[PDB]
Amino acid sequence: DNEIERVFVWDLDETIIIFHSLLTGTFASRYGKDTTTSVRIGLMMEEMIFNLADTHLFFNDLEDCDQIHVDDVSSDDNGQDLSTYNFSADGFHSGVDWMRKLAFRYRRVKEMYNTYKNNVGGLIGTPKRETWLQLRAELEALTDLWLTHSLKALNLINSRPNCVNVLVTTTQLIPALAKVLLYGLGSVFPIENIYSATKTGKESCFERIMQRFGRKAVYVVIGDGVKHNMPFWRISCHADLEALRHALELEYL
Ligand SMILES: O=C(N/N=C/c1ccc(Sc2ncccn2)o1)c1cccc(F)c1
């Protein structure tokens, strides 16, 4: 109620965030869909994602310096008006003066996320929004609206004032933020609740979450595939999501 009574940890890899099943063509051999179209949308979607991260989120600057959380380098940020500040003409390339030149970028990344997480058309201006809307619709027709079905459970946890949902993924932070922004997961996934388990591992992020949210809350993990007293909700199947949704409506979860 006043605090987070329950906390949900999502591992949307192998389905949404990381969809390597598309590119390998195994997705169509598993589900009987067309094999070539599946790979086509995958390469097209990955193109728009990395275009959004390069053109807006300084991905080339932060590719090798990818953090685990967005608020990690807030210690070296001297808050200043940087509207005139142009990031291209600074000392940054490839630290008290250069680690000072890293946080304001991530504060800018947080600003772009928290401003266009529900107005992606104002960030990637149409026709780019019209291109990705057609792009998502074509992929959702193959997966039988998996992301749309998965968003029903995400918004359900989000609306609960005692519940919050966090994201732990193996991709780098900036690409994962680009995927969450584009896919429409901006509202249901607060930017401070996204963890890129790339440098450390999945377990160092779990303890990172429990350290922040405390042990007085019930931790549940909903994901796919593979301690710390956190029950796991393997949700690979499509009708599985219906049951998880079904359990949330009746407050069993
Ligand atoms: O829908 C998306 N991923 N779905 C993945 C997935 C794996 C298994 C199933 S269930 C199913 N699939 C096919 C046939 C029968 N049942 O869905 C998606 C990923 C990234 C972006 C985006 F916009 C959408």
UniProtKB/Swiss-Prot annotation:
Listed result of changing A247R: Abolishes interaction with SIX1
Protein name per UniProt: Protein phosphatase EYA2
Job of this protein: Functions both as protein phosphatase and as transcriptional coactivator for SIX1, and probably also for SIX2, SIX4 and SIX5. Tyrosine phosphatase that dephosphorylates 'Tyr-142' of histone H2AX (H2AXY142ph) and promotes efficient DNA repair via the recruitment of DNA repair complexes containing MDC1. 'Tyr-142' phosphorylation of histone H2AX plays a central role in DNA repair and acts as a mark that distinguishes between apoptotic and repair responses to genotoxic stress. Its function as histone phosphatase may contribute to its function in transcription regulation during organogenesis.
GO process terms (BP): cell differentiation; DNA repair; extrinsic apoptotic signaling pathway in absence of ligand; mesodermal cell fate specification; mitochondrial outer membrane permeabilization; negative regulation of extrinsic apoptotic signaling pathway in absence of ligand; positive regulation of DNA repair; striated muscle tissue development
Gene, per the UniProt record: EYA2
Organism: Homo sapiens
Family: Belongs to the HAD-like hydrolase superfamily. EYA family.
Section of the entire sequence shown: 264 to 538 of 538
Chain residues that bind Mg(2+): D11, D13, D224
Source domain of life: Eukaryota
Main subcellular location: cytoplasm
Compartments, record wording: Cytoplasm; Nucleus
Keywords per UniProt: Activator, Chromatin regulator, Cytoplasm, Developmental protein, DNA damage, DNA repair, Hydrolase, Magnesium, Metal-binding, Nucleus, Protein phosphatase, Transcription, Transcription regulation
